[model samples]
Target chain A: KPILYSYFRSSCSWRVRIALALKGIDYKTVPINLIKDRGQQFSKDFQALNPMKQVPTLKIDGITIHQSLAIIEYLEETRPTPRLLPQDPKKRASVRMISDLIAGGIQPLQNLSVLKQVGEEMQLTWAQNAITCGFNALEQILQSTAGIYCVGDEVTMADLCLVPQVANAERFKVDLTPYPTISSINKRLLVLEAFQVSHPCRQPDTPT
Target chain B: KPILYSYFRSSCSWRVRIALALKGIDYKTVPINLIKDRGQQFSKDFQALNPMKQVPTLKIDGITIHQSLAIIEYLEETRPTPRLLPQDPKKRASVRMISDLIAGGIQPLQNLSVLKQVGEEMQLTWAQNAITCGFNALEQILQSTAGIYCVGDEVTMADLCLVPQVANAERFKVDLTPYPTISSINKRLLVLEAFQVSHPCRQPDTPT
Candidate 1:
């Protein structure tokens, strides 16, 4: 059985959970409460699995993988049908473009650990600026590219990454109105069973 | 001819530049001064190409691509020789994992725009902490996986991403001495003709 060491509210972990759900892959979740653990990730055991000490570490087929996008790409490679990545090289690159925009451009700046470093007085403003600045560009890209999802109607990895990011943004009170394309695509993606089942709120580890 | 909108100091841009050079593809540089322009990336024309308003936007085959990794992947697909990715699914995922540790984990937090948000007094410590944490993980991963490069003897996208990030960390005075594995691998990667030529300091737009 595939096992995922994940936390409920982590957008990165959510990215992988949504991908696994979309692929119809059954995987057991081992909730690693990132907050309650308060540096449990820093423990020797978890660190052995992932030197990065981040959640969403997957143990499958006796192989371990870290980094949410890499794990998703691994799943995509292993299960090609009902593809989360588009076929055409150009289309695939476009999907990756949007994925990187969220994963690299937004998540790192706004994630829990990084935000904690900024003084509380400035944390909200800092994260808000990061997400808002990212949405500004993502909305523009979605303008021409999004259909039922972030790219055409395929429900690709771009959408998977975007939905979780939007969830994070809303938690911080980022206004979604400015980016109609992102908001609409996210609205469409959220209703899908794949996303609905794997949402951060619905996850087993979500804080009560 | 392909054109890259790049800024010399931007580690993200150098990732693509190294990949392009390694692949022996030639392209012209259209420097977008991220600093002097005081947000030239935010300009309408630039943002149209890359919604994130970030550097290293590539115009190729009449299509524009934002996000450095996507551009590199697109290049990898078109130019498969001297491959930048591994063939085995697990190995490839490992390479991607290391790349993300740098691109998503280290670069975004330490990048110019994000650092500007932290008060100047705290910026150095902020950037150093981010880089040091990443290098900690990367060093552990490299300890087992690195052989001449980040993932075995072959140079992959992981190496391409790592070299520039180390450069950025130095700028922030993040000591690499503790992570001897990362420092040693970076030292090896730097001497390669591909990395030597594509380095930020060697770029045409590098401030004199």
Candidate 2:
């Protein structure tokens, strides 16, 4: 049995959670409260599994894997059914492109720990600014590739990255009104059972 | 023929350049001057190629692709002889983890545009700080995975991501002496023809 150690409200964790759900791979969720604990991830035990000290560490196949994208790619390779990547190389590269835009260009800049490290002094407008800039480009990409999902009709890894990020955008109070395509796709994805169950709000760690 | 649109000093661009060289894939370099142009990436032609308006956009296989990792993955898939990723599922995931740590976690924060967006007020001390923290975790990851390369003996994507970021750290004046393993591995990578030829200073657009 695979065990996922993640935190509620973590966009990165939510991404992997959605992937696991999509594959119909049963896994146990072990919540690591990132807020109150302050530095539980730095503990020797957790460090043994993940050196990054970040959440969404997946333990499967008698080995532990870290990084949300890596874990999802691993699952996609192993499971192979209900494919998360398109068959065509070009299409698959485009999906990876959009995913990278969010994963690298957007999400990391707006992460909670980043905010904490950049200090409470700057008012966090930079985070929202990054989201706005990133979403602007993402909306443009969607114009070309989006068809019910981020890349054509298939719900590729791009969609998994997109919805969770939009949720983060809302948290940062970044206006999504400008990007209609993003809004439309995210609305469609939110209705899916995979996204619904994997949502940060629906997670066990989230306080109602 | 593949044409890589990249900036001379851009670390992200360096990653793809190294990957292309490592795979022995020949490509033409078209520099998009990010700074002097006050952002040439915003131009209509560039945006048509890459909506994200970021550097390291590679035009290949009759399609334009953006994002460093995506392009590298495309290369790895299309040209599998000299593999940049490991064969084992677990090893591959670990490589991706290290790559993401740099691509998403470390690189974006200290980017030229990000620094501009965050304002000139911070004095870039934060750039060094991000490098410090990122490398701290990265060093720890290396302690387990390092073996003449970031993951194992073969030169993987993790090494591609690692070398360029270390260059960025040097620019930021971050003390890399603390991470001896990273330094040692980077030293070996620097000597290789793949990394040497793709270096920022050796780029076609770079000042002579």
Candidate 3:
């Protein structure tokens, strides 16, 4: 069986969880608490799986996959029944564009580690401002491409990425009023069984 | 004819240029001098093509496409003789993963505008340090995946992304000795006709 080394609060972990659930792939979850003990992600065993020592590592058939998007795409390719990508190359590229906008454009800026650096090394206010700026850009882009999902009616991989980032944005007190498309789509996504099952709130590690 | 609204030194523009040349496509270059008028990308004319206000926008068959990787993938889709992505889905995902490692992970942190912001708003030294750190991570990742090209023998879109970032990394005085894999592949790639033709130094706006 596929085993996921995950943390409920980690957005990257959440991204993979949503993808796994969407594809209807059953996997065992081994919670590696990111906050406790200066991050269990840094433990020697975990580092063996990923030198970068980041979370959401997937151990499948004895091979370990690091990086959330890579793992999710691997699953999509290996199990093509419930397609996570569009058949048309142009549409697939468009889906990738949206994914990059979130993964590359927004996530890194507001990433927990980066935010923590800004808070501890820089100032708490600067960290807050950085999160706000990134959230604003995300809102604008989300307004442009979102439908029932991030790209169209199909729940492509982009939706899996969008949900967690939106969750992180809300935590920063980012006003979602300007992002009607993202708000509506995120609300709709929550109603789906796939997303609902993978929600951080519903995760085993989530605090009451 | 396809027209590319590009700035000479933009890495995103360079990615598209390499893709176009790799596919043997003929296109006209419309120079948008970003530095001269505080970035021509923000002008009303450019904004009509890209609301994101970024250069490297492509106009093809009366449709304007923004985002570099998206443009490259579109080119690959439209003209498939010399494939930019692998036919096997797993290989394709691996290509995308490597491309994302650069596009999503490294590029944004070291972008020209972000560097400028870091200099003006944040501490200049901190910006440089961040650039070094990003390069360090990139070098480590690239070391593992690179071969004769970025991913084994074939030249994929990942190579297009790597060259520009390496150029930027050099400007930051990043030590390349530790990343023999990256340096070796980049050395080979520099000799390729596609990379040579798309070089920023060869652009019309580049100073003699």
Which candidate comes out best when scored by lDDT? 2
Higher-ranked by DockQ: 2 or 3: 2
Cα lDDT of model 2 overall?
Answer: 0.86
Candidate that would win on TM-score: 1
**Which residue pairs come into collision in candidate 2?**
none
- Stretches of candidate 1 off by over 4 Å are A37-39, A42-45, A206-208, B37-39, B42-45
**What are the lDDT figures for the candidates, one per model?**
0.85, 0.86, 0.74
DockQ of each: 0.82, 0.72, 0.38
Worst 10 residues of 3 chain B by lDDT: B122-131
Q: Report the number of the highest-DockQ candidate.
A: 1
Give the range of the ten consecutive residues with the poorest summed lDDT in model 2 chain B.
B114-123
lDDT of 1 by residue, A1-208 (tens): 9999988888888889988898888999987776555656756667768977787799987888999999999999998878998888988888999999899888887888676666678788888988998998888888777888889988998988998899888999999989888888888878889888998768886555
Mark the regions of model 3 whose C-alpha exceeds 4 Å error after superposition.
A41-48, A51-53, A61-64, A119-145, A204-208, B42-48, B120-144, B204-208
Best of the two (2, 3) by TM-score: 2
Worst 10 residues of 1 chain A by lDDT: A34-43
- Scored by TM against the true chain B, the candidates give 0.96, 0.95, 0.90
**Chain B, candidate 3: TM-score:** 0.90
